[PDB]
């Protein structure tokens, strides 16, 4: 009668071998799975979001194969190596397949400044991936996405030479990759920025599909020029906290730490005859 599963299972596990910041990154990427499940973008596991734990130790966290994005938790995540070897397995009695990690592995070998890579297979983004001139910035959200890189995809990248062409086409500074006929890939230093860019590019693709359907041609549309378009909050910091807070209000045990408190909590009305609280 409920799909609701506590996203924090670190206390009930009380096992495994963890890094000094690993247990927060696990909860963050589990929450990313929960958001992408809730919007209806993805349901079936195809190794969508990958996160790098540390710059030196590698040991990238991925979802196990066979578990739908609704059922992924913190303890179910699997820490794998760059080649596909199992560094650490969580409490998930499933066969281990690291085939889908190969798509993220050469991007790990290409750019280190990225930690979070999100791959999509939504119908709108896959239609844009088949759209030969790519994303046309006729909307504000596509202007907010930024620059794109386009790469031909033959469906395989185990080959030693295909990696060179992939990292050639990605470029030195480009955080959105569009594989032809294979959806889109978003690239972010934090999970927040990557999730923000995923949402904005998905909205832009949804706008563009309807626009190209309704207009019937490029000339029926208007395109503002890229040259004409041309405290501190990080790119995804502000929105992601609101989403985590709302899931906390519903009841998911999100382990994301909030930078500032929500409510003032005016002091309540105190009586002296209270039994002193707590069990000590």
């Amino acid at each position: 009668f409920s799909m609701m599963t506590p996203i924090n299972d670190l206390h009930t596990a009380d096992s495994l071998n963890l890094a000094k910041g690993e247990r927060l990154m696990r909860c963050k990427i589990s929450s990313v799975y929960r958001l992408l499940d809730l919007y209806g973008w993805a349901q079936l596991s195809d190794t969508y979001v990958t996160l790098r734990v540390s710059k030196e130790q590698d040991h990238f966290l991925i979802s196990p194969k066979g578990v739908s994005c609704s059922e992924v938790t913190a303890s179910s995540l699997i820490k794998v190596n760059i080649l596909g070897e199992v560094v650490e397995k969580g409490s998930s009695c499933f066969p281990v397949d690291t085939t889908g990690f190969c798509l993220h592995s050469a991007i790990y070998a290409a750019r280190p400044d990225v930690r979070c890579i999100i791959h999509l297979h939504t119908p709108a983004t896959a239609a844009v991936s088949a759209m030969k001139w790519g994303l046309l910035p006729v909307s504000h959200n596509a202007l907010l996405v930024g620059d794109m890189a386009y790469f031909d995809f033959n469906g395989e990248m185990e080959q030693e030479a295909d990696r060179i062409n992939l990292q050639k086409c990605l470029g030195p500074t480009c955080k959105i990759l569009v594989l032809r006929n294979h959806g889109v890939v978003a690239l972010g230093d934090t999970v927040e920025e990557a999730f923000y860019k995923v949402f904005h590019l998905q909205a832009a693709c949804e706008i563009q599909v309807s626009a190209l359907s309704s207009a019937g041609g490029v000339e029926n549309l208007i395109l503002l020029e890229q040259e004409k378009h041309r405290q501190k909050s990080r790119l995804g910091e502000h929105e992601f906290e609101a989403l985590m807070r709302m899931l906390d209000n519903l009841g998911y045990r999100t382990g994301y730490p909030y930078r500032y408190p929500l409510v003032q909590e005016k002091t309540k009305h105190k009586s002296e005859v209270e039994i002193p609280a707590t069990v000590t």
Binding site: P6, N8, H11, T12, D248, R253, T254, G255, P257, I275, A277, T278, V279
Partner: peptide, 14 residues
């Protein structure tokens, strides 16, 4: 174990 994170929890048993 069921409460949200950084939550004030106390049991008062006379």
């Amino acid at each position: 174990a069921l409460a949200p994170s950084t939550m004030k929890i106390k049991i008062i048993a006379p």
